[PDB]
Structure 1
Amino acid sequence: WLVLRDGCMHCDADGLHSLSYHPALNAILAVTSRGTIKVIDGTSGATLQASALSAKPGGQVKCQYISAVDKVIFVDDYAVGCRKDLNGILLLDTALQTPVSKQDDVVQLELPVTEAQQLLSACLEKVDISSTEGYDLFITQLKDGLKNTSHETAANHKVAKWATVTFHLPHHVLKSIASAIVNELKKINQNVAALPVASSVMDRLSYLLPSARPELGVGPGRSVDRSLMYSEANRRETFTSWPHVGYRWAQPDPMAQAGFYHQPASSGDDRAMCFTCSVCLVCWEPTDEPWSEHERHSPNCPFVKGEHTQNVPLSVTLATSPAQFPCTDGTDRISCFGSGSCPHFLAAATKRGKICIWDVSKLMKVHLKFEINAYDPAIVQQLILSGAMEVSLDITALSILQQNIPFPCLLAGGLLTYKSPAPLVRRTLPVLLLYSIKESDPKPGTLVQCLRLPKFAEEENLCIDSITPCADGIHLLVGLRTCPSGGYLVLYKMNYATRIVTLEEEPIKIQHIKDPQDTITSLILLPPDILDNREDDCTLGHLVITTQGGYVKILDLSNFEILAKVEPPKKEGTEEQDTFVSVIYCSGTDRLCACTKGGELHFLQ
């Protein structure tokens, strides 16, 4: 494993609080406190993107690279961005675009090259619609962007690919253009490739306004308007009591992906009815795969041939769910949160007071509205059983980690911020509070057994910046941070031997290093067959610590044994420390990233 020096180049010196990567379109998602994007080529130095797209600057662009399934969930200061488009592509330039409050807001459409060029074709090459309102302004914007790129087109077209036109046109022009295109494409019912584009634009126009959003027509014997169907969500929402789920290949998700709608009724239990020609079919069967059956009874469906005409797959169908604003003020601070490596559970901890979790498998619906009593005796009972005053609950983060009487409870801790004088002595103790996930058909949320942090861990009041389960999934790794050799750590075991889930009754070992000054700020855990050559030739992971002096220490977490030491390099031209600040595991590259505040890069072969 040779190591060589090649060179360095400034990449990012704007500061970093969280790290992420974008593996879909090979355009690195930059996490910045402002939202600006800067990309510089290293080998040739050619510019790939020259555009400062900022619809509403000042928002924290926080996205986390979930490498379990290689998906990134972008989160802004307002809502949660589940950008699941066709083939699961993501958006980079919309890092500062937020849901609108009025029609006066500035929106950055920033469509990719595909749909932007499709609009260009439908406006000049395919169809000529120059007589509509706002056509001149949009064409002028597109040609202005093209002319701006034309100077850099002599090198590459990626400038036009990413330095897109600032599509901040007023919503009235876009509304008029969308209405004209939809009318033209629906009066003759022509299924050209521009039909999905027109449908998507009209869907945005009719859904992004909560005031103009109609209701859902759910219920037998009730009619549904034909205008809202340009999204498949209406069809997918009717699969409430489908009784053929127990079929072999008629699983809920694949069958709903096909694009049918079923009214719950005793008649027509397995009756089939599609949309292409409204043919009355029968005999839904376990071996009757929905896509295969759709091709069998309707080969003219555009899904069969792959044409882009009224194509709304499951990802596009379920990626149009609306969002609601939790609070108008949000006076509660934002300190630390994360989603972990568990994409199945959506973890966007809104520490503003209200946290609602919607299951990905099921459809989004209104669930519950309530207010919390300020005199709950459960916490006081827990405190008293361990051994003037106003106690209130502030919901900060919900975390679900996994490998009745009592009710199933989970080690979900919250950041209690209450100050007491230190006759009383100020002490902080984590607590576990859970709501009623589902009735087990007593009082829901009864704690089974709580795991207490070690004495030294509570002594320094370390806060869990993030939670990351171990690779094997048996043991739990807890992240720690310190606000401005190992340190203070936690080590316990959970029992998974009995048929019913239980918990261990005795700690095994507690790691207490008498060196709190150099507490680990961040760390990663890797299987025993990645890092070391001996390990490669051969489950708790590998513990590598970083020192302020720049020395690199390689230790094996299995035995806490020091393996090798590497001296820090020397900065060129200046004596300032060339420290590595970025450390994150990217499944796209599988390398240990290292970006410096001074603007230098190094590669470890």
Structure 2
Amino acid sequence: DGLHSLSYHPALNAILAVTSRGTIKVIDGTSGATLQASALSAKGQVKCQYISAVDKVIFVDDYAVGCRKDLNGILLLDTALQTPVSKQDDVVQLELPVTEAQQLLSACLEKVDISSTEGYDLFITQLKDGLKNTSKVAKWATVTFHLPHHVLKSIASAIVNELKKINQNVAALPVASSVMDRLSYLLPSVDRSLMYSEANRRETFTSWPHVGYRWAQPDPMAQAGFYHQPASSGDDRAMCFTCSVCLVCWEPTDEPWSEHERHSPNCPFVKGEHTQNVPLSVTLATSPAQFPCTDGTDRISCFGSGSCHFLAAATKRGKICIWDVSKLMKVHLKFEINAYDPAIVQQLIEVSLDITALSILQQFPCLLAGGLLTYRRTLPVLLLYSIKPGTLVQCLRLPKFAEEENLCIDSITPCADGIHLLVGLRTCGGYLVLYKMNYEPIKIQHIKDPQDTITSLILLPLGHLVITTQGGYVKILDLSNFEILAKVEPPKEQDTFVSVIYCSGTDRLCACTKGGELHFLQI
């Protein structure tokens, strides 16, 4: 069919290719064998770029920005672009690994009698057929529940309750806890029973007085199973969700697991038993997509990330969202872009503004968007907004030729080395202008050939660059003087290369053609 894009996961050895059909194909980065072919449950072009600074796979559809981390060495893709529902009657989608699917199916068929629960027949039917169909591809296989939120929640709660009643520690208890927590997140609409998930325990620590401790920090404390339930001012009261242990008056040398084990070796969580715990690793690996707009009505045009703890996106209506994507993907700031700004009204020398490229800069942090102003003439410019909010720090008019050459920005990437910013301009056959980061350009280059119009950028570590041109020729290159290292040519009529990526783990570059083939180029 066609791939149309590419990204690479270094923590894994998986190449995440988009497909012209809107699905995502994960193929092996060492042998090129297909590991999985999963549709993200999206609603338009599908984005899949893995971000290295944040260490997460950021998917984007026209409407929502999914952000899935890896778990147990794979990614759960079947619902990366599923957004939270509002009514319990709404059918949620929820994928489980084949192994966890077997855990749940067995514990339902051999361990408990949660049958007669609302919509139990649909649940068992889906699990059975999912496991039958799938009967290294196995490590990535999954089974997806498509069930009314209440059916899935009731069945998960029933399984948890019965597995807690029989008290026989079976693998299905954590799987049902994971299903329950995922549902809790899919319907956003101290309680000791809500601490079975690592995220809840972490959020409990908001008043932890020992932020200076090397090992007793809230993140490790929640990881070890503790949650903070202060009883008085400055009270460092940490209780385990399942153990019933309670600890106080911590010391700098304390380490969560150490104190937990010495103070209660019998805890099922400390022993590594199959408890109800839902680690942050499963929350991050299945968190639901999030709309940038307060309604999600618009289309998404930009999903630029920063070298920094931050992701950003822009919608066609001028609303821009910025997520503290460190772990929790909590929306950090949403603001509005208005072309009639004090900076823009001057730098223009009726009007509308459309953002087309985004980026955030780090070694005070700033959001650097690329915009096209449309009076009626047009002009591509840079826009430096604040984050730490919505105040347009600097509108930067690009050199004069962009006024009449009918160009719009198409990419903005931080320099491979840093302290430098490469901007690219295409027509609404292009320009590459390099700015020195400002803690007019410091360099410029013009491309004239219509078969050398850029169609991608990898910006290998002024570092290096690897693009793909309209002619289908990737031009692995160095930015110091713009020297072509190897303008590889498309294979066979010709099958034009459409994108490239670099495998930090295997050192072999990958190229993907429009036709959908994959070629390994050595460097």
Is the shorter-chain TM-score for this pair beyond 0.5, marking a shared fold? yes
Instruction: Say whether the 8 Å CA contact 1:41–1:48 is kept in structure 2.
Output: yes
Find the residue that maps to 1:341 and give its secondary structure: coil
**Aligned match of 1:175:** 153
Deviation digits for residues 196-220 of structure 1 (CA, Å, limit 9, x no counterpart)? 2222233344443344xxxxxxxxx
Secondary structure at 1:366 match in 2: strand
In 1, the alpha carbon distance for the partners of 2:337 and 2:99 equals 49
Q: Which residue of 1 aligns with 2:253?
A: 287
1:452 counterpart (382, 397, 407): 397
Native 8 Å contact 2:76 2:286 kept in 1 = no
- Cα drift, residue 44 of structure 1: 12
* d(CA) in 2 for partners of 1:561, 1:25: 32
How far apart, CA to CA, are the structure 2 residues paired with 1:210 and 1:84? Answer: 20
What SS class does the counterpart of residue 48 from structure 2 fall into? strand
Gaps of 5+ in 2: none
Q: 1:455 and 1:374 mapped to 2: Cα distance?
A: 20
Q: Is contact 2:301–2:356 with CA below 8 Å preserved after alignment?
A: no
Alignment CA distance shift 1:279-1:42 (3 Å): closer
In structure 2, how many angstroms separate the alpha carbons of the residues matched to 1:560 and 1:134?
Answer: 63
Structure 2 CA distance for aligned equivalents of residues 381 and 595 of structure 1: 44
Work out whether residues 550 and 567 of structure 1, in 8 Å CA contact, stay in contact via their aligned partners in 2: yes
Spell out, residue by residue over 1:428-480, the C-alpha distance to the aligned partner (whole angstroms, 9 max, x if none). 4556666664xxxxx98777766542333454343333332222112212244
Residue 490 of structure 1 and its aligned partner are, at CA, apart by: 0.7
Q: Distance in 2 between matches of 1:161 and 1:495?
A: 47
Q: Helix, strand or coil: the match of 2:302? A: coil
Cα distance between partner residues in 1 of 2:157 and 2:419: 56
CA distance in 2 between partners of 1:464 and 1:367 (Å): 26
* Distance change (3 Å), C-alpha of 1:78 and 1:196: farther
Aligned length: 521
Task: Verify the 8 A CA contact 2:66 2:289 in the aligned structure 1.
Answer: no
Answer yes or no: is the 8 Å Cα contact 1:272–1:280 preserved in 2.
Answer: yes
C-alpha distance in 1, partners of 2:248/2:450?
71
**Aligned mates of 2:333, 2:479 — CA distance in 1:** 45
Contact 1:554 1:564 in 2 (8 A): yes
1:293 deviates by 1.9
Distance 1:22 1:409 in 2: 27
Contact 1:64–1:72 (8 Å) recurs in 2 = yes
Counterpart of 1:409 in structure 2 is: 366
Report how far residue 564 of structure 1 moved. 6.6
Query: 2:262 & 2:29 partners in 1: Cα distance?
Result: 52
User: Would you say the 8 A contact 1:467–1:477 is kept in 2?
Assistant: yes
Q: In the TM superposition, what is the alpha-carbon distance from 1:118 to its structure 2 partner?
A: 0.7
Alignment TM-score, normalising by the size of structure 2: 0.78
Question: Contact (CA 8 Å) 1:340, 1:467: kept in 2 or not?
Answer: no
Superposed counterparts of 1:341-490, under 5 Å: 342=308, 344-360=309-325, 376-383=341-348, 390=350, 399-403=359-363, 411-418=368-375, 426-429=376-379, 437=387, 451-482=396-427, 487-490=430-433
Q: CA deviation at 1:121?
A: 2.0
Matched residues in 2 for 1:564 and 1:75: separation?
Answer: 32
State the alpha-carbon separation in 2 of the partners of residues 193 and 577 from structure 1: 52
| Shift of residue 102, structure 1, vs aligned partner | 4.0
The structural deviation recorded for 1:17 is 4.5
Q: 1:579 to 1:228 in 2, by over 3 A?
A: same
Shift of 1:122: 0.5
- How much does 1:111 deviate? 0.9
- Change over 3 Å in CA distance of 1:431–1:280 after alignment to 2: same
Q: 1:22 to 1:105 in 2, by over 3 A?
A: farther
Query: For the structure 1 residues 97 and 27, does the alpha-carbon distance in structure 2 shift closer, same or farther, using more than 3 Å as the test?
Result: farther
Post-superposition shift, 1:297? 1.7
2:478 counterpart (534, 545, 556) = 556
Structure 1 unmatched runs, 5+: 1-13, 151-157, 212-223, 385-389, 419-425, 438-442, 497-505, 527-539, 570-574
Asked if the contact 2:40/2:77 (under 8 Å) is kept, the reply is no
> Secondary structure, in 3 states, of the residue corresponding to 1:520?
coil
Pair 1:358–1:266, CA change in 2 (3 A) = farther
**Aligned partners of 2:115 and 2:232: how far apart in 1?**
53
Bigger radius of gyration among the two = 1
Could you give the per-residue CA deviations for residues 50-96 of structure 1, whole angstroms, max 9, x where no partner exists? 8888686xx54321122446531223444332334655742122256
CA shift, 1:112, in A, is 0.5
Note if contact 1:86-1:313 (Cα within 8 Å) is conserved in structure 2: no
Whole-Å Cα distance in 1 between the matches of residues 133 and 456 of structure 2? Answer: 43
Q: Is the 8 A contact 2:320 2:335 kept in 1?
A: no
Contact 1:74–1:80 at 8 Å: present in 2 too? yes
1:113: how far off?
1.4
Change (3 A) 1:345 1:382: same
Higher RCO, Cα 8 Å, sep 6+: 1
Aligned to 1:603: 520
Q: In 1, are the aligned partners of 2:357 and 2:411 still within 8 Å (CA)?
A: no
The 1:355–1:564 alpha-carbon spacing in structure 2 relative to 1, beyond 3 Å, is closer
Q: Alpha-carbon deviation of 1:556?
A: 4.2
Q: Distance in 2 between matches of 1:321 and 1:49?
A: 20
Identity percentage over the alignment?
Answer: 100
Describe the SS at the equivalent of 2:466. strand
CA shift, 1:225, in A, is 4.1
Report the 3-state secondary structure (helix = DSSP H, G, I; strand = E; otherwise coil) of the residue aligned with 2:332: coil
Equivalent residue number for residue 525 of structure 1: 459
CA offsets 1:234-281 (integer angstroms, 9 cap, x no match): 332233343322234334533444443435676454455444554454
CA contact (8 A) 2:36 2:140 kept: yes
Structure 1 residues 102, 414: CA separation in 2 closer, same or farther (over 3 Å shift)? same
Residues in 1 aligned to 2:257 and 2:202: alpha-carbon distance in whole angstroms? 15
Decide whether aligned partners of structure 1 residues 332 and 133 sit closer, same or farther in structure 2, where only a CA change above 3 A counts: closer
User: What is the alpha-carbon distance in structure 2 between the residues aligned to residue 55 and residue 507 of structure 1?
Assistant: 39
Q: CA RMSD in A?
A: 4.7
Q: Is the 8 A contact 2:5 2:512 kept in 1?
A: no
Q: Secondary structure at the match of 1:144?
A: helix
- Indicate whether 1:494 and 2:437 are aligned: yes
Distance 2:415 2:384 in 1: 24
CA pair 465-327 structure 1, distance change in 2 beyond 3 A: same
Q: Structure 1: how far apart are the matches of 2:497 and 2:345?
A: 46
Structure 1 pair 361/547, CA: closer, same or farther in 2 (3 Å)?
closer
